[PDB]
């Protein structure tokens, strides 16, 4: 079999930049090679094929290129809807196989996340489980420290975080930080702080609230 | 317009089979070869077989060879991949893709993929609770409010608001698995705070799997 | 439709193997029927299958 | 193992980009390399320093 060697594994850059990613086949593949976007959750989509091809359609600022066993994927002047993860394929010989895929993310100025926290619902708290959520909204960069404080006992072992696909027009990101309790713990306590240390802030914010208040 | 349509994802228990269907419209799969890729959750794309409708060659990954068998019935124009002895690594979202369409050497159109679950636990719907907008989520004359989905399996839920009339300032987070086995998500929306009670705000919850469809109206407490 | 007689005996392999349940049974048949050129392949996992929940 | 070496790209025109290769420290940090010769084609020769003992490379371009 033939394998395809992508990279980087990751590229960050800023709206604009010119940017290249790579792949290498282990052996020649003479042109069989295409190169796909994927936004998380969709299907791959086509942008260029036989190496150089643009597929119609695509823009004129992606383009390919090939030298011996190296293929070179450009974006000429990165837009922000360009985040999305790029995977080659060789078509030379079956089976067709795919780099491991390089994904591109867009770099931007700081900004500092809005910070909010909601109670568990009386719905939620009718069954015996209480949950918390924080929630970081529209920030940059992603990297954040999310910290739960009940009655000042800092939380461990005892949350999870997700956090959004950067947004298509300006890059941000949000994140939600979920506390799971039980009923009758969380009714043991009454002072819930969410605590968020990022860049954008000059010192981290805490977000609280008292149980029936 | 070009397309391609696969069904028949779902649950299933290891060592059990499965059939998927990907249904072909805007051209004939008797002028291409038909693909299946999958893609594990978090992963990457993984070739899993083809095949060549109008003469019936087929070709397959090693590692689903005597398992998985593709085939394809031209007079419904549409291609099938019958998964049996299912492992947890097949676990992934399938895609259909035509390759060869109008001369076009690599796989110009794919379809929308059906996720395959392979695991021994049970279906399970999800409870819907709302995240009510709040003096503690409001800043700069802008309100946060969603639903909390939690507690279901399998993936996946879909969240929309307003019955998709409402999509600007809507964050759906990515599903966390918990240690209880199952999934949470949140969905949120950014909002005027002066909207608050005289705009209805409603998370439309599907969870196909379970057949669970939930509405669930979010207010102020 | 029609088979020859080395399909007619992968169907009567399965179909007799007593540890496989009745969606794996069907299941292999029906890949039998997709795409016979697979039929040696498709036998031997369904005898690993079999031989597994013994 | 599993490393991820760091790479802060760094064009003659200020112009910054960062990036990440993975795989077994050795195989990494080939690729790095690799990955610099060929952005020297278009950026310019290319120089690279390391820090955190090889896991951590500042590559400028020269124009
Ligand atoms: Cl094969």
């Known amino acids: 079999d033939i394998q395809m060697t992508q990279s980087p594994s990751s590229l960050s850059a800023s709206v604009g930049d010119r940017v290249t990613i790579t792949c290498r086949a282990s052996?020649?593949?003479?042109?069989?090679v295409a190169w796909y976007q994927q936004k998380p959750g969709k299907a791959p989509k086509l942008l260029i094929y036989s190496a150089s091809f643009l597929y119609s359609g695509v823009p004129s600022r992606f383009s390919g290129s090939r030298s011996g066993t190296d293929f070179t994927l450009t974006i000429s002047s990165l837009q922000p809807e360009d985040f999305a993860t790029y995977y080659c394929q060789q078509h030379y010989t079956t089976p067709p196989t795919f780099g491991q895929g390089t994904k591109v993310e867009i770099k931007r100025t700081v900004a500092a996340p809005s910070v909010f926290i909601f109670p568990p619902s009386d719905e939620q708290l009718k069954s015996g489980t209480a949950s918390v959520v924080c929630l970081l909204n529209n920030f940059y960069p992603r990297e954040a420290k999310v910290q739960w404080k009940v009655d000042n006992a800092l939380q461990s072992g005892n949350s999870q975080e997700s956090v959004t696909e950067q947004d298509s027009k300006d890059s941000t990101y949000s994140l939600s930080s979920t506390l799971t309790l039980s009923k009758a713990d969380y009714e043991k306590h009454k002072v819930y702080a969410c605590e968020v240390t990022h860049q954008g802030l000059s010192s981290p914010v805490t977000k609280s609230f008292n149980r029936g208040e | 317009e070009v397309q391609l349509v696969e069904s028949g994802g779902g649950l299933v228990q290891p060592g059990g089979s499965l059939r998927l269907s990907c249904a072909a419209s805007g051209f004939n799969i008797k002028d291409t070869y038909i693909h299946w890729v999958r893609q594990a959750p978090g992963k990457g794309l993984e070739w899993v077989a083809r095949?060549?409708?109008?003469?019936?060659?087929?070709r397959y990954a090693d590692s689903v060879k005597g398992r998985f068998t593709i085939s394809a019935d031209t007079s419904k124009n549409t291609a099938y991949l019958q998964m049996n002895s299912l492992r947890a690594e097949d676990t992934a979202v399938y895609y259909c893709?035509?390759?060869?369409?109008?001369?076009?050497?690599?796989?110009?159109?794919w379809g929308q993929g059906t996720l395959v679950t392979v695991s021994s636990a049970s279906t399970k719907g999800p409870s819907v609770f709302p995240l009510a907008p709040s003096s503690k989520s409001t800043s700069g004359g802008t309100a946060a409010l969603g639903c909390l989905v939690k507690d279901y399996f399998p993936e996946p839920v879909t969240v929309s608001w307003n019955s998709g009339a409402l999509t600007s300032g809507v964050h759906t987070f990515p599903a966390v698995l918990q240690s209880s086995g199952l999934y949470s998500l949140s969905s949120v929306v950014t909002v005027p705070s002066s909207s608050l009670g005289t705009q209805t705000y409603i998370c439309n919850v599907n969870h196909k799997p379970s057949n669970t469809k939930v509405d669930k109206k979010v207010e102020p407490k | 439709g029609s088979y020859n007689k080395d399909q007619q005996s992968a169907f009567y392999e399965i179909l007799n193997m007593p540890n496989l349940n009745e969606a794996q049974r069907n299941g292999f048949i029906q890949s039998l029927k997709d795409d016979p050129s697979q039929s040696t392949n498709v036998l031997g996992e369904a005898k690993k299958l079999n031989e597994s929940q013994a | 193992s599993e490393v991820t070496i760091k790479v802060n790209l760094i064009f003659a025109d200020g112009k910054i980009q960062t990036a990440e290769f993975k795989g077994t420290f050795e195989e990494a940090t080939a690729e790095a390399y690799r990955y610099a010769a060929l952005l020297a084609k278009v950026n310019g020769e290319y120089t690279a320093d390391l820090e955190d003992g090889g896991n951590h490379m500042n590559i400028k371009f020269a124009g």
């Open positions: 052996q020649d593949v003479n042109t069989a």
């Open positions: 095949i060549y409708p109008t003469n019936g060659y087929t």
């Open positions: 893709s035509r390759w060869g369409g109008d001369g076009f050497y690599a796989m110009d159109y």
